[PDB]
């Protein structure tokens, strides 16, 4: 259970905090599972979703793999290239079907440099925890 | 305004209550001289309750 009083366990307080959260917190909330292959390489269970990430949806209808073309933190959803609603008119511009990032597994990551620096900081912090704190 | 109709039916609902056994035989209003002498007669031989 929770032994800390500072964190709220109220449904009302929790939903308001998620529904209206700062963008820094929206990022962590919008994390996604690193693949078995990536996890072995980087030693991090889940990394926050980015706009160059290629991800494989594993539950929702539309279970394919694509790059993340757009991230809309306000809608708490990400848009994956190639997963769209059926464009009624054939000669029409596609509308992306937003997928939640929980429903996805990160096949590839946009390596960047800050991503690499962030991956390392966790690797040493997790090592302190693995050293039984 | 004054009227006593239904008084007798109300009185006889469960009435005609007799006075009580203690009332018939009581030491109230009796001659004080009779009462004093009665206590002395009682206070001797079997009737005496004195220790």
């Amino acid at each position: 259970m929770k032994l800390n009083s500072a964190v709220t366990a109220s449904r009302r307080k929790c939903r308001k905090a998620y529904f209206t959260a700062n963008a820094e917190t929206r990022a962590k909330m919008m994390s996604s599972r690193l693949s078995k292959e990536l996890r072995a390489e980087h030693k991090i269970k889940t990394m926050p979703i980015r706009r160059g990430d290629i991800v494989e949806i594993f539950t929702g209808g539309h279970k394919g793999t694509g790059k993340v073309v757009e991230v809309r933190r306000r809608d708490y959803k990400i848009c994956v290239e190639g997963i769209n609603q059926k464009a009624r008119n054939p000669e029409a511009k596609p509308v992306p079907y937003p997928i939640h990032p929980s429903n996805c597994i990160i096949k590839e990551l946009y390596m960047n440099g800050s991503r690499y620096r962030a991956i390392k900081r966790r690797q040493e912090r997790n090592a302190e925890r693995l050293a039984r704190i | 305004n004054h009227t006593s109709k239904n008084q007798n039916r109300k009185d006889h609902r469960n009435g005609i209550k007799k006075p009580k056994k203690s009332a018939y035989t009581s030491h109230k209003g009796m001659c004080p001289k009779y009462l004093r002498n009665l206590r002395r007669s009682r206070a001797n031989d079997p009737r005496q309750s004195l220790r």
Binding site: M1, A9, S10, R12 | -
Partner: protein
């Protein structure tokens, strides 16, 4: 009478005498009363705002305007009444209410003792709803050394017959049926064993096990001993807890345990005793009623009353 102690392995490690609390007469009424009173004392006060419906300015318009005489605002809107929309409730709730009920110490102790005693009755536990078929003995006394891992505790519980009760709790979690879901009370699970621990640091190991609760012999809780004002909870005593029960229950100033009583079976055996049956005298044979039929009409019927006729 000594209660068998089974170790984490599950095999009769030692024997311990029965604490005399388990000889206390089983009173369900004393338990229910103190349970009801102590649940009320935990209740947090609720009330409406004193300034609700009084914040507006409304005056009865008055007779003659063809409108009912209830306070109405500038517009002519009904206000300030239990029947008016936006009005104060006729008797507003206040926190001045008595949310707590006092209990005499003796009566509280009598209840706590009769609840621990109820745990010993084999059927009381099954009646309450615990699954106790695989449990070897009641009370369950298990010598478990300090346990800090759920898997170690789970093995103890599996090897002593309580896994089915823990599984009844695990597979009983559902969303609630009311506004309580919204009011931070969304999930309800079935209540399971109570592990009484003395100096055996098994609290960390057993805490996340589903439905199971822990309580130091220093402070047994009657709302725990009888969940739902229904006594009969499987209690997995640590061996220190049983060996300390005669101490805990004597350290109560000069509190003397309520004297043992009788049971319906022990009133039935007493009733069937030869002396009681010998006193019984059979009664007179009863009356024959027989609904009236016309006697005059039939020859056989008339002969019972008028044979010569």
């Amino acid at each position: 009478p000594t209660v068998k102690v089974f170790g984490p392995t599950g095999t009769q490690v030692a024997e311990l005498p029965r604490p005399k609390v388990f000889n206390v007469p089983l009173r369900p009424d004393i338990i229910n009363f103190v349970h009801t009173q102590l649940r009320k004392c935990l209740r947090t006060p609720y009330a409406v705002s004193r300034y609700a419906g009084v914040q507006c300015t409304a005056h009865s318009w008055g007779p003659g305007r063809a409108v009912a005489r209830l306070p109405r605002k500038h517009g002519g809107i009904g206000a300030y009444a239990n029947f008016a929309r936006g009005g104060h409730m006729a008797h507003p709730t206040t926190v001045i209410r008595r949310w707590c009920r006092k209990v005499n110490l003796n009566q509280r102790r009598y209840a706590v003792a009769s609840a621990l005693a109820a745990s010993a009755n084999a059927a009381l536990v099954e009646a309450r709803g615990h699954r106790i078929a695989d449990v070897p003995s009641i009370p369950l006394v298990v010598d478990t050394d300090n346990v800090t891992k759920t898997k170690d505790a789970l093995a103890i519980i599996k090897a002593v017959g309580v896994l089915r009760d823990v599984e009844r709790c695990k597979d009983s979690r559902h969303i609630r049926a009311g506004r309580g879901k919204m009011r931070n009370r969304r999930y309800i699970t079935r209540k399971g064993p109570l592990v009484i621990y003395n100096t055996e640091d098994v609290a960390r190991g057993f805490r996340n096990l589903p439905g199971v609760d822990l309580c130091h012999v220093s402070s047994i809780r009657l709302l725990e001993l009888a969940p739902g004002s229904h006594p009969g909870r499987l209690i997995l005593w640590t061996k220190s807890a049983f060996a300390s029960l005669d101490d805990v229950y004597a350290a109560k100033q000069n509190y003397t345990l309520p004297r043992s009583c009788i049971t319906q079976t022990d009133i039935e055996r007493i009733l069937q005793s030869d002396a009681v049956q010998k006193t019984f005298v059979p009664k007179r044979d009863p009356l024959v009623i027989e609904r009236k039929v016309d006697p005059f009409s039939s020859k056989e019927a008339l002969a019972r009353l008028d044979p010569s006729g």
